[model samples]
Target: EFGCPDNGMSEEARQKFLEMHNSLRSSVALGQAKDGAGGNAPKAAKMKTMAYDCEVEKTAMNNAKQCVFKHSQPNQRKGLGENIFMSSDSGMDKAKAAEQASKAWFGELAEKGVGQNLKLTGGLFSRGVGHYTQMVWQETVKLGCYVEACSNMCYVVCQYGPAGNMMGKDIYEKGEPCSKCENCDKEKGLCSA
Candidate 1:
């Protein structure tokens, strides 16, 4: 979904939104790739953690439209914020609010059959970018499923406040016969898993 409104936005605002969204998406994807590549202890560790942060923040942004559509008042212009502290009464309260929102959003997805076979792959809490005192909590959600003739997997890197209330989500799909399966004919370049 488009984060900012598409209807009445100025070209400058739209361009800014697209630039920020694309950059963040690239960062989140990079982090996910590095984390998935499991090697080189120190760098891997740092990349994995940083990637988690990026994912969560990305997820939050992607899902922000839902929260605003459902929870915000009709006239309320700005919904959530990059720094959730702007919406909460205190730092502690901000964390709690973000956590609740995250849970609720996931729950909603699950109800819609989007979170089947879900699992928690990783998580961490860290200091915010420029503020040593600000803390952000992030977690990874992995879901795997088989439907009809295809197998699908999804990963959600999510973060609760002070980085940004967002999560990064991606899905991978493979046809019935995956390339690695032995039962399929090699001539077709596919394996029926």
Candidate 2:
């Protein structure tokens, strides 16, 4: 079940998505990911590394295969947080698409900016960075994605487990990375089993 999804994502693409996701999370957890309005975002104490999930990928595939360039309804993505990206290339490049989508989603931190407000307040969610927050959400530990090539577009959807970006909550605890975890990938700034 840890293998690539049946939705056409190759082994390389899966590795790319997982590595990119973790690297971005590592950057944020190390206080290196800058915010537009603010200086540097706070560091995370126990950011958990995300792993690919089969069911999550299947769920995302259901929406992506439709080739629709829109967010799936709340009911459809229950128990998960989703980020969608669309490119006009419409070419099938699974690995490239995965990297591009991951970067675009994680780029919200610098693009829209989370500023100094690390809490998942209503205003924060309203602005943007939902994708960024979800990617770095310390508690979220699963990831899965799908890329669909439509007539004139490439739709990318990545779903997160135990969904993040909850209102009235901190995106992650503020402290040194992996400080609270027993087994830590100190270099990666993440917790592991």
Candidate 3:
């Protein structure tokens, strides 16, 4: 079950959301995630895969359903990391909306280029790639997303568990893939429990 009452998200949308997130993380783990105006991101030794959470979805849904196209406060998100996007294509279906929003959030890496910054330094935040950083933050393992068809826009939000982007924190341990994990997906370079 997808989990959560009044959920407008479909299994397809859920699958796509989780799949897109992991795939983006996989690119980073494999050292294939590109940065703007530079080479790829550093290989992650133990990038964690994200899991879908019903409670988190509910929280995201609460914010999206408001159709405000704005971020919910930290208290409303219960400390979970959030990335929000608004699209002018209000007629798009949920699955389509979900994919585009997720891509746009992750796309920050390529669009603005984090250069070599992978840590949560003040400079990284100042570069306006917080959404991309949160999307691939190594410690984040839970993901829940929602898309709302507002009158003039489609609002998208995805929340992360345990969050990321804490000041002075490294986004992920940079090293050879699988070096820090007990088991790994060789092709994707992601850690598995």
TM-score of each: 0.21, 0.93, 0.94
The number of residue pairs in model 3 that clash at the backbone is 1
Error of 2 at 102 (Å): 1.2
- The CA-based lDDT of model 3 is what? 0.86
Minimum summed lDDT over a 10-residue window in model 2 is located at 1-10
- Candidate 1 C-alpha lDDT tens digits along 47-156: 11211223333344343423332222312323222322122232222233334333333232223222211121222111112110111112212111000111221111
- Predicted candidate 3 versus true structure: per-residue lDDT over 1-193, tens digit per residue: 4465556787788888999999999998888988895999888999988899988888898899899878789999887988888889987888898899888888888998886656677877888888988998999999998888889998888889988888988888899988898878887889974
Candidate 2: where is the Cα deviation over 4 Å? none
Worst 10 residues of 3 by lDDT: 1-10
Model 2 CA lDDT for position 116: 68
RMSD after CA superposition, every candidate: 17.3, 1.6, 1.5
Clashing pairs in 2: none
The per-residue C-alpha lDDT of model 1 at residue 69 equals 23
Q: Which is the better candidate, 2 or 3, if ranked by TM-score? A: 3
Tell me which of candidates 1 and 3 scores higher on TM-score: 3
- Stretches of candidate 1 off by over 4 Å are 1-8, 32-193
For residue 15, give model 3's deviation from the true position in Å.
Answer: 0.7
